[PDB]
């Protein structure tokens, strides 16, 4: 059996257990991925590699992650790109920026990307986002073109509570986002 | 209280390597916003 | 609040969440620090840095660790050097070998070492080990000359269950070692 | 069952840095033995 757990309820300026990429950094007790500036990318990864499936046994891990995040845009009409929680190879570096969310490089399935992401997408990319043009949550598998999406109304500046859980017996990934009002 | 839920089947074993790193990413374009995380908890169990 | 937790009951051949130093590696589902060979050192560290105290608040962490270890000597009367659980700076590398256990460099107090170790010492080093010559458990603070020791009878090839706990309220470090017999 | 206990006061704040790595070390000399670890768990909580 192998378990990994961590809880961080307030970030420190020297958070040595995180890996920061691009614009990512900590403090005001918070983790900042991007400031409100154009054409940028920030990522933050947990330091320890996680054993998510076992080659010997073929077992796959159950996991749950909870986090609170905020998007703060100058006006709620012009926001861009979005945010993701992602699972990727151990030595991942930032992928394409902008609509690709720093996690993918195409809208076609690329098996070498080897990444699963839960996206909170704030900008409609005609090439691949839902034609309703709504902001949305999406499950992404080796492509920026989600396997499934749900329309989501962004509450600018509000804390969003998210829970993402994976059930190994069923291979079901569940995502929940909750705003207090 | 406003909630959004989404679920789908992902065969993790066929997509990601045996060892992974987890994390967050955010990006901006011509339009932008700040993206911040206030708290984070994670638990995994491999039997 | 910040918590870090892990459990590993079976080690994999490529255990990417540990850092190996010297001869350490994993095999037959066990972590092997040293094989039964002369003059060697092996160390294994958990990958993620651990936040043990904070300069901002003055808070110190409570921690507990459980492990089961085995010492297998070809001859039960001729053993040597010992084994330790330790806490050190993030960039720690092997120190002096043999009776220094790969963690210390001197019997004199060296504040720069910044290491606390719990030793399970199997070989009497006349310069600093207890004069009774008994194998012993010890608490080591910046020196190979333990601050406190307890005689221990090695049980060759037997599994030892160890619990080490630190109580931040009192600054007390406790070690327990148990053999099925 | 055979058990042994030991304790002492160690002012951690004064000896190790704020961030640490934890692990095991073993050594041999002219006399030797294999040193192996079969299981390991760890929990820390910083308030
Ligand atoms: Ca988009
Ligand atoms: Ca000794
Ligand atoms: Mn999308
Ligand atoms: Mn000793």
* Among the listed residues C170, C175, C169, C168, the one whose alpha carbon sits nearest the alpha carbon of residue C140: C175
Residue in A with minimal Cα distance to B45: A3
| Dihedral Cα C8, C10, C11, C15, nearest 10 deg | -50
* Among the listed residues A155, D31, D38, D13, the one whose alpha carbon sits nearest the alpha carbon of residue C61: D13
Tell me the structure's resolution in angstroms, rounded to a single decimal: 1.7
Residues 3-42 of D with CB under 8 A from C: 3-13, 15-42
Q: Is A121 annotated as a binding residue?
A: yes
CA A99 – CA A105 distance, rounded (Å): 9
Q: Which tokens sit at A86?
A: 């992602």
Q: Which residues pair with D5 in a beta bridge?
A: C176
Q: Which tokens sit at C103?
A: 């963690």
Q: Which tokens sit at A58?
A: 């073929």
Chains C and D touch (3+ CB pairs under 8 A): yes
Report the 3 state secondary structure along chain B: CEEEEEEEECCHHHHCCCEEEEEEEEECCCCCCEEEEEEEEEEEEEC
From the list C68, C102, C139, the residue facing D27 with the nearest CB is C102
From the list C61, C171, C179, the residue facing D10 with the nearest CB is C171
Beta strands at A160-167 and A2-8: parallel, antiparallel or unpaired? unpaired
Q: A57-78 burial, b if ≥16 CB within 10 A, otherwise e?
A: eebbbbbbbbbbbbbebeeeee
Q: Which tokens sit at C99?
A: 């009776």
User: N- to C-terminal Cα distance for chain C?
Assistant: 40
Q: Which tokens sit at D35?
A: 């040193």
Chain B residue numbers with beta carbons less than 8 Å from the beta carbon of A69 are 24, 35-38
* Among the listed residues A165, A161, A153, the one whose alpha carbon sits nearest the alpha carbon of residue A180: A161
Residue C73: CB atoms within 10 Å: 20
| Burial class for B11, CB neighbours closer than 10 Å (0-12, 13-18, 19+) | exposed
| Burial class for C27, CB neighbours closer than 10 Å (0-12, 13-18, 19+) | exposed
A22: Cα separation from own chain's centroid: 15
* Among the listed residues C177, A66, C120, C153, the one whose alpha carbon sits nearest the alpha carbon of residue D24: C120
* Among the listed residues C160, C169, C89, the one whose alpha carbon sits nearest the alpha carbon of residue C120: C160
B39 touches A9 (CB < 8 A): yes
Q: Which domains does chain C have, with CATH numbers?
A: 1-181 (2.60.120.200)
* Among the listed residues C69, C91, C72, the one whose alpha carbon sits nearest the alpha carbon of residue C80: C72
Q: Which tokens sit at A34?
A: 């991007």
Chain A residue numbers with beta carbons less than 8 Å from the beta carbon of C54 are 12
| Dihedral Cα C167, C170, C171, C176, nearest 10 deg | -50
* Tokens 């599994």 sit on residue: C159
From the list D5, D27, D36, the residue facing C175 with the nearest CB is D5
- Ion ligand 2: residues, Cβ under 5 Å: C 99, 121, 123, 125, 129
CA A171 – CA A150 distance, rounded (Å): 19
SS3 state of residue C98: helix
Question: What's the sign of the alpha-carbon dihedral C41, C45, C49, C54?
Answer: negative
Phi, psi (degrees; rounded to nearest 5) at A99: -60, -15
Number of domains in chain B: 1
For D44, the domain range is 1-47
* Among the listed residues B30, A12, A29, the one whose alpha carbon sits nearest the alpha carbon of residue C55: A12
Q: Which tokens sit at C148?
A: 């406190």
Residue C55: CB atoms within 10 Å: 11
DSSP structure class, residue A38: S
SS3 state of residue A29: coil
Experimental method of this PDB entry: X-ray
Whether chain B has a CB inside 8 Å of the CB on A127: the answer is no
> Please, which residues have CB within 8 angstroms of residue D25's CB and are 6 or more apart in sequence?
C33, C41, C42, C43, C83, C84, C86, C94, C101, C102, C103, C117
Residue A41 alpha carbon to ligand 1 centre in Å: 14
CA C169 – CA C62 distance, rounded (Å): 8
* Tokens 């995502």 sit on residue: A175
> Please, which residues have CB within 8 angstroms of residue A129's CB and are 6 or more apart in sequence?
A121, A123, A136, A149
* Tokens 């806490």 sit on residue: C87
Chain A residue numbers with beta carbons less than 8 Å from the beta carbon of B17 are 89-90, 114
* Among the listed residues A171, A61, A52, the one whose alpha carbon sits nearest the alpha carbon of residue B8: A171
């Amino acid at each position: 059996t192998e378990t990994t757990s961590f809880l961080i309820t307030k970030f420190s300026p020297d958070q040595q257990n995180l890996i920061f990429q691009g614009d990512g950094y900590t403090t005001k007790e918070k983790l900042t991925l991007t400031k409100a500036v154009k054409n940028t990318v920030g990522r933050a990864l947990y330091s320890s590699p996680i054993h998510i499936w076992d080659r010997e046994t073929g077992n796959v891990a159950n996991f749950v992650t909870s986090f609170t995040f905020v998007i703060n845009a100058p006006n709620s009409y012009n926001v861009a790109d979005g945010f993701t929680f992602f699972i990727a190879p151990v030595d991942t570096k930032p992928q394409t920026g902008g609509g690709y969310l720093g996690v993918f490089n195409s809208a076609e399935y690329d098996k070498t990307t080897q990444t699963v992401a839960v996206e909170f997408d704030t900008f409609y990319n005609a090439a691949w986002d839902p034609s309703n043009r709504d902001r949305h949550i999406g499950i992404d598998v080796n492509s920026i073109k989600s396997v499934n999406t749900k329309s989501w109304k962004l509450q600018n500046g509000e804390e969003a509570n998210v829970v993402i859980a994976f059930n190994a017996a069923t291979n079901v990934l569940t995502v929940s986002l909750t705003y207090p009002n | 209280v406003t909630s959004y839920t989404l679920s789908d089947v992902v065969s993790l074993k066929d997509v990601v390597p045996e060892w992974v790193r987890i994390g967050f990413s955010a990006t901006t374009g011509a339009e932008y916003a700040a993206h911040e995380v206030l708290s984070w908890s994670f638990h995994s169990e491999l039997s």
